[PDB]
Amino acid sequence: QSAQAAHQALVEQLDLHSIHKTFRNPNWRPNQRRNKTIKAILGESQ
DNA sequence: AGTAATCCCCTTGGCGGTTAAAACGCGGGGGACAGCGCGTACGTGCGTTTAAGCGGTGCTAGAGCTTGCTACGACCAATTGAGCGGCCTCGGCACCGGGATTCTCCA
Numbered sequence: 001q002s003a004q005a006a007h008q009a010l011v012e013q014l015d016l017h018s019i020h021k022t023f024r025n026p027n028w029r030p031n032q033r034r035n036k037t038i039k040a041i042l043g044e045s046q
Numbered sequence: 047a048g049t050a051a052t053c054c055c056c057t058t059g060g061c062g063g064t065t066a067a068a069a070c071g072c073g074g075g076g077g078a079c080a081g082c083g084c085g086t087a088c089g090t091g092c093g094t095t096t097a098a099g100c101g102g103t104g105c106t107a108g109a110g111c112t113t114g115c116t117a118c119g120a121c122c123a124a125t126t127g128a129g130c131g132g133c134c135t136c137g138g139c140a141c142c143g144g145g146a147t148t149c150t151c152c153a
Binding site: 033040043 | 080081082083
């Protein structure tokens with residue numbers, strides 16, 4: 001149905017995953033557990 | 047027939063002591079609890095199919111109610127012995143002591 005095809009076409013148009021970010025450094029990778037909470041970050045004050 | 051003194055009994059309260067149980071101090075250990083990483087196991091979403099739910103049809107078991115009477119328990123009076131209150135004693139269980147065996151912990 002055309003409505004569902006247009007919906008997927010819009011979602012494809014909105015998608016960032018289809019986009020290569022030429023400005024990104026391909027080498028650098030984070031520590032995957034960098035997402036500490038404020039509670040945990042304040043726990044580094046000690 | 048009533049109300050108060052008299053007398054039994056059994057519960058509450060106090061005093062003394064004695065000693066066994068509660069309170070207090072202190073070192074350390076190890077168990078509570080916060081922190082981290084992972085990974086697997088539970089919540090989510092989709093397509094599938096399965097049968098629970100509804101509207102409808104058919105039957106007969108058996109729940110529920112009445113009738114009729116006689117077998118079985120309620121009630122009473124006379125009989126008696128099984129079961130309770132009181133007294134006795136001796137033997138089971140505790141309590142102690144002492145030597146023997148076990149278990150625990152640091153080496």
